[PDB]
Each structure stands twice: as C-alpha cells, then as structure tokens.
Design a protein around this ligand. Structure first.
Ligand SMILES: [Cl-]
Ligand code: NA
Length: 838
C-alpha cells in the first residue's frame, strides 16, 4: 500500500543479446543500495535492444540510478553501464513505472578510491585528523583528452592518528587514464556535514578498463589549510550559482571579428577556476578584478564576495554595457591604473553622451569649407549615443540584492552598479544570508565603510527602482568620482535633499571632483552655502533635468567641465563658478537663458575651446547681457554658439571686450541688419577681431552688412554663410577678404516670400581664395562673368531665369574638376556634357 513497481527497457544509442540479468545501482536519501533483476527478451528494433526487466517492488519516492551491470548466462559482467543525465526515477504508490535505460556507445569501467596521507606522510600533525573524514569530492581528469569529471559526496569507509580510508561504492568512468586533480573532504556530526579542506592535487595515475573495475585510485590527502586563492575560486562559483550563472550570455554590443565567450566555465580543474572572462588575477592567483557586465546576471550577490579581499575593481553593470559590454570603448577597467588610464575611464561618460564638436552647428557649406582646409582641424562627426525617455529604465540585469560583505573589500578602488532593478535599502545594507558560513564569520569582524580608503570611483547608473541614493555613499572616506545619472526613480525633492546631504557631508563634500547627475529630475540646486563646501569639484553634468533655479558654488570652485544643457534655466548667477586652464567646451544649450552670463574673462591667458548657448532666449529682453558694458569681461573661447536665440542686435559686446573668437555661430536669430561699428569702434578695430575666420548668419532677416566686413577689419575671413536672409542686393563687403574660401547666400526672401536676389555679384571670379559659392534658390538673371576654374564648387540651381555661359570651365567640368549644381531646365550655354534641355 506504500510500495510501487519499476521495470527497465534497454534502448539503443546514436552487439549484446547474450545478457539475461541486470543489477541497477540506486540511491534513495543516502541509501546506496543495488538490486539484481532478470531480463526478458522480446522483438528487437532500431530503438530497442529487445530486453525488459522483471517488476521491482520499491517504496514510493524519488531514486537516482548511479549505474548498472548486464550479465550473460554464465553470470559474468557483459556491460558496465553509466546512468546518464536521465539518472532519476520516481516510484509511485500502487504504480508501475517503466524506466528507459539507453546503452551509451562510450565504453566505461568502474573505480574505487583510496585516500592516503601525502606531503606530511607521517610528519607534524596537520590542520585536521585524517580519521573522522566522513565524505569526499574528487575531480578526476582524463590524462589524454583533459576532460574533468566531478564525483560528489562519496562515503569514506575508514577501517582501523592513522590514515588510510576508502570509497567502497564504485563510480562509472569512461575507459582511459586519469589523475585525481582536486578534492574536498567533509566531517559529519549528527546531520551537519562540514568542509575540512579543498586542495588542488595530482594523484598517482590510474587506468580504467572497459567493463572492468579499477581498485584503490589515489586521492592524496594533504591535511592542510585551504589556500586563499582556492577560497577565492570557490567564492566565484558561489557568486555564479547565486546569480543564475548557467543562464549567462555575454553581449559584446558590437559585431566585429571576435566571437566572445558567452559565460564562465567551472567544468575544468579547480586550479583553473580563476581563468574566467571578466576576472583579473594577481601573480599568486588571487582575484583582483571582477566584472559581471554583459552577462545578464539575475539574483542576489551572496556574502561569498567578502572573501575576494584582493579585489581592486568590481563591476555589476556599466553605462556602456549595451554598447560595448565589459569594455569602455576599447579599453577595460583594470586593477592599479595610472592617473591617465583612470581619467580616460572617468571621461568615458562625457565622451559617450555629452561632448560634441561645436562646428557641427555650422551649415553643411561651412563644415565642408573647414574639412577641406588643411590649416584647420577636421570636424569630428557626432558619435554620441542618443538617449530617449523610453530607453531610460532599460535593465541589463535582474540583480535585486547586494551583500554588505562589500565592506570587507578594503583594497577596492572602483565599484560600478548600473541598469539594475534593486531598491536603495538592498545595496550593501545586510547579509545576503545571515546563516551562511561567510556572514557567520564577518558578523564577528568589525566591517565598516570607513576602511575602503582606496575607493575613489562609484557608479550608480540607471537604477529605476531606486527612490533615493543608498547610505553607503555618505560613509565612503575618499570618494572622488560619482555617477548617478538616469535615476528618475528619485523625485525632484528627494534628489535636492540627496545632493544637499552629499555637499554638507564632511566626508564626501570636500572630496568629490566629478559629479555626473544627468537625465534626472532635479528642479532646484541645493543652497549655495552647501554647494560652496564642494571645494574640489571639477566636473558637473546636469543635462536633461528640469532645473529652473541655480545656486552658486562661488569663484573658489574651479570647473574644467560644466554641462547644464536641456533644462529650464533663465539666468546663471554672476558667481556660479570659476573655470580651470584645462576647459575644452561648456554646455548651456536648450534652456530659457535671457542673457550671456558674465562668468568668463577675455583677459585670461587660457583660451577655452568653446561655449554653447544654442536654443535659448538671448536678446528677448532687449540686450544680450544683464550687466553694464563697463562691467562685461567677455569670453575666452575660440567658438561661441549663439544659434536659435532671439538676438536682434549683433553681439558687439564680445568683440569690444577683446574675446579671442575665431568662429561665431549666430544662425536662427532675429537680426535685420549688421550696421557699421558692430564689429569695430569708430576709428579703429577691436584687439582680436582679426581672429574671426568663420561667420554663420543663416536664418536671420538681414538686409545689409557694412564696411565692418572688409579686409580692413576681417582680413582672414575664410567662411561665411548668409543663406536664408533678406538680401535683395548682394553684400560684397565680405568678398574683400583675400582669404575668403567659401561664401553662401542661398534662398533670399522677403516677408512676402518673393525671390528678392536677382543680380549676380559681378567681379566675384577675381576673389583670390574663393573655392565655393552658393547662390542657388534665388532669381539670378544674366551672368556676364567668365567663370574661373579656381572657383570650382558653384551652386546656381533653382534660378529659373538665369542666363549663363560655362564654356570657360566646360573642359574642367568634363575632367571631373568642377562641381556645378544646376537644373537641366536652366539656360546654361556652353557645355553639352550637362544635358541641358534644348
Ligand atoms: Cl537683442
Ligand atoms: Na580573464
């Protein structure tokens, strides 16, 4: 009534039929017991060997088949069968189970082990007694094909301090030559089975023979302390098993010529467990780096991570994970980096999402002009990652918990968390399991965050369910770089509080150097008196927040980088901050700025690369600056971007203050003219006006310029674009420049949408440096000038009443040395190769 039945059916794989018995070896809750049954023969098939077993009465429950033996008429072992991966069978109360046994093509033999004292072969008593070893785990490695096999929880029968014991239950190994390469011994006390030691060894070579038993295979017991590097490798296996390791699949984020490894591997010799993708080791074999980035881990970080005390770089996610997996562009995060390597890695976020060449705000004409000019550096295409509101909150992993054992990793320099679903109270606040051998030990150690005096870099990027910053940040002694971008789980009120705490904290406040907090919800900056405490700040990213109110840091805070783009800032305090002699480009674009803030100095010996004030409301209040002309200090920057604003008056203020501007981008503004003394005083020139080589004035309402644009004021003027304006008469003043290489005046219209530009600029072919001209989409009529082969890029398309003869440049057009933009409908005489409609 408590029992059921089993029968076995022999199946073929992918000779026999002399066998008439089977001894199936099974295990049911530590009862390694075998039973002999007879074979009944039926019709053979290409799937069935045609042999079925007698009913076997067993008590209802789950059983695991270890192996089986087949026997002929003479009752000799005709086959030593392995269980396979279909090792389990469950007997049912009053049921009849039929188990399919598939005969493996690979010949197997059987083995027994003999545990022996080695190294301390009758010497100074070891870490534990040989006697009272109750269970062992042995790893055997095939000496030819190098395949390892793990034989777990074998019962050690010790018959008699003294030291010679055996594993009486035989195991099934494929025929070949082996060596024991590792073991774990256990002591049993009641029901508690405890670890004695784990060692990497090389036991004496044994050989397995087909359908025969090899007796007493060498397991060389050391009776020593488990080495720290072996403890590390076992912790890695724990971490891997706790974070759904079997289901990891590394994503490199790029299709190149490398096919990266998908996962870690523990089906190899124990001594090799430190060789893993993402794991970095020291000369003694200890773990110094661990990166789970790219694998897609799921689970809780166990207390076992506390063992890896030589860990210097630790990473669970990255802002770059979906782009380049484990890498930051081309380089990796490694232990003990130089100041240069560390800085390159810290600047990765900036390069990936914030910086861009300010000359990408110029027209295609002006960019082309610069790119084909060897006297100027080429314009770097926008390689940044565009990030939409839907892309934010996308997880790279399902890591829901971080053990507080992280407090034991005192040599830790850099820690990265990103794209995880954990809550702020689950980030290194508690033990993953208070009853783990690790937590039971570390509870008795005085573990504190105050000991991570080497941890300078922390990343908490895009953690959606994080409602505030975790407490561990405020207890870090030497924090320098912090990234908390895309934590839209934190409210505007909560973020202001968290930043205030961070600044007010006597630990971190005066130590923070880099602060990335873009794509968040901040509406107001913390109180100035608190922001002033951030004495060592050098980088600040507040892009894509909802910032409507700024507070100053003061002029004692010297910033190298400042990115305030995409917010709702109306004014920047005159004392917001100061800047270093290392500034490349500052971002203030996409705001509601009414004025250019007086926070720069044109009298500064260091010249910044650029200031970006595009997409604001400058000039909407009547003047481009809020201070007096006498108080205005100018801007020490080569490029000034003021496109998409409400500028009605040309910013003379910049030139009058001797600003070393070489490119001025004033496109998409409301100017109707640039009268005389806009770029100069009445009887002279401003100190640095001669540096102005590029001018973008497209999409304005300009009807006139002045003699301010002649070589007497702009002698090195190279590129100018006045396309989409209201010129009815060509402004020839810029053509006075001997250095003018490109000029554009496309699509001139009046308010009433008429094509107001009809006259060709007669004499333009004499411009000594002019290469490109754009006069397309106007109403150009007759052209009497003989075109020069020197001005070899000409756009005259969309001029329907044009009458021009191109005979002079006709052989150059044919030789592919002249680019003419035109319509086959236009009256263009002199070149048959053009295909003009006759
Ligand atoms: Cl204005
Ligand atoms: Na590695």
């Amino acid at each position: 009534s408590q029992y059921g039945y089993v029968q076995f059916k022999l199946y073929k794989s992918t000779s026999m039929s002399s066998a008439q018995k089977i001894k199936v070896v099974m295990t049911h809750n530590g009862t390694t017991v075998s039973q002999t049954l007879l074979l009944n023969a039926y019709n053979a098939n290409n799937a069935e060997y045609g042999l079925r077993s007698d009913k076997l009465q067993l008590l209802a429950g789950t059983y695991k088949i270890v192996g089986y033996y087949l026997y002929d008429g003479l009752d000799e072992v005709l086959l030593a069968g392995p269980a396979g991966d279909d090792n389990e069978l469950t007997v049912v109360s009053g049921g009849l189970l039929e188990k399919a046994l598939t005969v493996d093509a690979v010949p197997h033999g059987t083995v027994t082990f003999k545990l022996s004292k080695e190294g301390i072969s009758t010497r100074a008593a070891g870490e534990y007694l040989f006697s009272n070893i109750r269970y062992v785990d042995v790893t055997v490695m095939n000496s030819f094909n190098r395949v390892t096999t793990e034989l777990k929880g074998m019962k050690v029968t010790y018959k008699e301090d003294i030291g010679v014991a055996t594993c009486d239950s035989a195991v099934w190994l494929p025929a070949g030559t082996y060596q024991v390469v590792a073991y774990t011994t256990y002591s049993q006390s009641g029901i508690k089975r405890s670890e004695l030691e784990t060692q990497s060894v090389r036991g004496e070579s044994f050989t397995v023979i087909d359908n025969k038993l090899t007796k007493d295979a060498n397991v060389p017991i050391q009776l020593k302390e488990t080495a720290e590097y072996i403890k590390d490798y076992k912790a890695l296996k724990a971490i891997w098993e706790a974070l759904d390791g079997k289901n990891w699949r590394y994503y490199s984020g790029t299709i190149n010529n490398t096919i990266h490894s998908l996962n870690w591997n523990f089906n190899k010799e124990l001594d090799m467990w430190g060789d893993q993708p993402g794991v970095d080791l020291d000369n003694n074999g200890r773990v110094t780096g661990l990166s789970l980035a790219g694998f897609g881990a799921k689970g809780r970080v166990p207390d076992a991570i506390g063992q890896l005390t030589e860990l210097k770089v630790l990473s669970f996610g990255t802002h770059s994970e979906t782009v380049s997996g484990r890498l930051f562009g081309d380089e990796e995060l490694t232990p003990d980096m130089s100041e240069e390597r560390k800085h390159r890695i810290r600047m990765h976020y900036k390069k990936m999402f914030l910086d861009y060449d300010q000359r990408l705000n110029l027209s295609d004409l002006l960019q082309d002009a610069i790119n084909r000019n060897p006297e100027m550096k080429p314009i770097k295409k926008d390689s940044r990652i565009s990030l939409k509101d839907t892309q934010i909150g996308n997880l790279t992993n399902r890591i829901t918990f971080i053990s507080k054992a992280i407090q034991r990793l005192t040599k830790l320099q850099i820690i990265y968390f990103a794209n995880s679903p954990f809550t702020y109270d689950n980030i290194a606040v508690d033990w993953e399991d208070a009853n783990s051998d690790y937590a039971k030990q570390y509870e008795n150690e005085e573990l504190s965050w105050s000991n991570l005096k080497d941890l300078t870099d922390v990343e908490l990027y895009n953690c959606p369910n994080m409602t505030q910053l975790p407490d561990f940040l405020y207890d870090l002694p030497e924090l320098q770089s912090l990234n908390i971008a895309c934590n839209r789980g934190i409210s505007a009120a909560q973020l202001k509080a968290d930043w205030t705490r961070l600044a007010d904290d006597e630990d971190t406040g005066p130590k923070i150097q880099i602060f990335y907090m873009g794509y968040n919800n901040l509406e107001e900056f913390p109180a100035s008196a608190s922001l002033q405490k951030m004495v060592k700040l050098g980088l600040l990213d507040c892009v894509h927040n909802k910032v409507r109110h700024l507070e100053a840091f003061g002029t004692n805070v010297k910033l190298t980088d400042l990115k305030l783009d995409y917010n709702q800032i109306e004014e920047i305090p005159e004392d917001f901050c100061a800047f270093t002699d290392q500034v490349e480009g500052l971002g203030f674009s996409h705001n509601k700025l009414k004025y250019i803030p007086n926070i720069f100095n044109a009298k500064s010996v260091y010249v910044m690369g650029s200031v970006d004030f595009s997409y604001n409301k400058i000039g909407s209040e009547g003047r481009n600056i809020s201070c007096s002309m006498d108080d205005y200090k100018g801007i020490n920057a080569s490029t000034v971007t003021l496109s998409y604003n409400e500028i009605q008056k040309f910013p003379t203020e910049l030139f009058a203050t001797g600003s070393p501007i070489s490119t001025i981008i004033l496109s998409n503004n409301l100017m109707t003219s640039i009268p005389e003394n806009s770029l100069k005083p009445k009887d002279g020139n401003y100190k640095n006006t001669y540096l102005l080589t590029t001018i973008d004035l497209r999409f304005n309402k300009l009807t006139s310029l002045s003699d301010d644009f002649r070589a007497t004021t702009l002698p090195y003027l190279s590129n100018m674009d006045v396309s989409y304006n209201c010129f009815s008469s060509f402004p020839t003043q810029p053509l006075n420049s001997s250095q003018l290489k490109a000029f554009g005046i496309r699509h001139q219209r009046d308010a009433e949408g008429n094509r107001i530009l009809r006259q060709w600029p007669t004499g333009i072919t004499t411009c000594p440096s002019l290469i490109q001209l754009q006069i397309g989409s106007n109403d150009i009529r007759k052209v009497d000038e003989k075109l020069t082969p020197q001005l070899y890029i000409l756009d005259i398309a969309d001029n329907p009443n044009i009458s021009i003869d191109v005979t002079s440049v006709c052989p150059y057009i044919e030789a592919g040395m002249y680019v003419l933009l035109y319509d086959k409908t236009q009256d263009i005489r002199g070149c048959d190769a053009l295909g003009i409609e006759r």
